[PDB]
Amino acid sequence: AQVATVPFRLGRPEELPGTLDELRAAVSARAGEAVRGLNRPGARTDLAALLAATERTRAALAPVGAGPVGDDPSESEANRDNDLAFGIVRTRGPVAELLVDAALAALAGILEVAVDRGSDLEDAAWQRFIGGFDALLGWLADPHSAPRPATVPGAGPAGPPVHQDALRRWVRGHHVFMVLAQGCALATACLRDSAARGDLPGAEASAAAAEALMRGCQGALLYAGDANREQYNEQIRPTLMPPVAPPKMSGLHWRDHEVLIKELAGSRDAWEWLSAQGSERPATFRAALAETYDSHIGVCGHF
Numbered sequence: 001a002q003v004a005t006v007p008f009r010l011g012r013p014e015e016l017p018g019t020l021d022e023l024r025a026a027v028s029a030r031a032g033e034a035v036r037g038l039n040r041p042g043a044r045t046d047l048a049a050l051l052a053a054t055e056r057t058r059a060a061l062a063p064v065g066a067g068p069v070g071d072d073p074s075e076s077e078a079n080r081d082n083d084l085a086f087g088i089v090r091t092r093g094p095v096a097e098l099l100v101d102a103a104l105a106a107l108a109g110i111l112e113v114a115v116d117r118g119s120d121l122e123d124a125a126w127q128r129f130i131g132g133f134d135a136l137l138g139w140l141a142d143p144h145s146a147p148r149p150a151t152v153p154g155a156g157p158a159g160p161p162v163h164q165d166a167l168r169r170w171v172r173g174h175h176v177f178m179v180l181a182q183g184c185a186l187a188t189a190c191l192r193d194s195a196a197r198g199d200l201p202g203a204e205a206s207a208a209a210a211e212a213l214m215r216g217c218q219g220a221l222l223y224a225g226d227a228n229r230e231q232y233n234e235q236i237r238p239t240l241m242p243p244v245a246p247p248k249m250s251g252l253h254w255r256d257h258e259v260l261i262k263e264l265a266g267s268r269d270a271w272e273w274l275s276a277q278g279s280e281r282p283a284t285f286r287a288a289l290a291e292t293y294d295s296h297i298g299v300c301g302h303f
């Protein structure tokens with residue numbers, strides 16, 4: 001709809017790999033490709049070369065999309081209308097590798113607006129918001145080491161508010177939601193599995209990935225509210241037409257979010273287990289966890 005790239009191809013979060021070995025054999029080859037693309041020389045000089053690097057990468061990548069899913073018996077209309085509302089199409093194929101394409105696609109969508117018209121988001125919140133991609137792809141490239149944070153160029157100050165540019169950031173922002181939700185769902189399932197199997201190094205890396213993905217979602221919720229408050233201001237005009245409403249998420253029941261909170265639940269005993277074995281991630285995660293829950297205010301309706 002010229003506000004976001006549609007359809008946004010995405011995997012079924014239920015089919016996501018569940019253990020650190022199944023994740024690596026499935027996604028580490030395509031993720032490491034994407035990591036090499038987003039850190040090739042010159043790509044981090046400014047925000048412009050980062051967008052060009054994002055496009056060269058996903059262009060070079062052999063697309064894995066085996067078409068739309070279609071007849072899905074596990075999908076409800078509460079999931080479908082929620083998927084339609086933001087142009088999401090569930091796509092057949094390597095679900096983990098699709099998450100790599102969705103990440104590269106959603107990031108490029110965020111980078112277009114910030115190159116033409118900058119961003120009034122704080123330079124500290126801007127970092128964790130983009131670093132969530134570096135976290136996801138860096139960890140997907142090597143699910144057994146904590147991802148090391150790379151440099152993220154700044155954004156210019158917010159230029160002239162173009163018509164419904166806060167709507168472009170509202171739809172393009174919700175794609176980052178489902179991208180980062182699936183990723184954080186992985187690192188929790190791997191943390192749960194590694195903990196039960198006595199994989200202490202694997203538990204540490206998965207927790208580190210989940211935390212940087214949680215901090216990356218907090219910055220995604222600030223970016224969302226920045227565009228929703230700017231939306232609330234854009235509607236003081238009395239409109240003789242029926243006032244077209246911004247697409248909203250219909251309650252907690254969007255698919256990737258349903259999976260992530262189920263993963264987060266029942267992962268309780270693993271976080272306490274990491275804290276006992278001398279880890280420092282259990283503390284800084286609960287920080288990012290509460291920071292993210294607070295950041296729903298101003299973004300989610302039923303909230």
Ligand code: HEC
Binds near residue numbers: 220
């Ligand atoms: C509106 C729909 C949203 C959107 C845009 C996001 N979340 Fe979620 N979330 C939502 C609700 C209604 C609730 C329950 C609130 C309550 O019961 O008081 C939640 C809860 C969470 C949680 C807590 C999980 C738990 O307590 O076990 C987390 C961690 C969470 N939500 C994460 C999250 C992230 C990372 C989002 C951006 C991708 C996000 N939410 C968006 C509803 C909504």
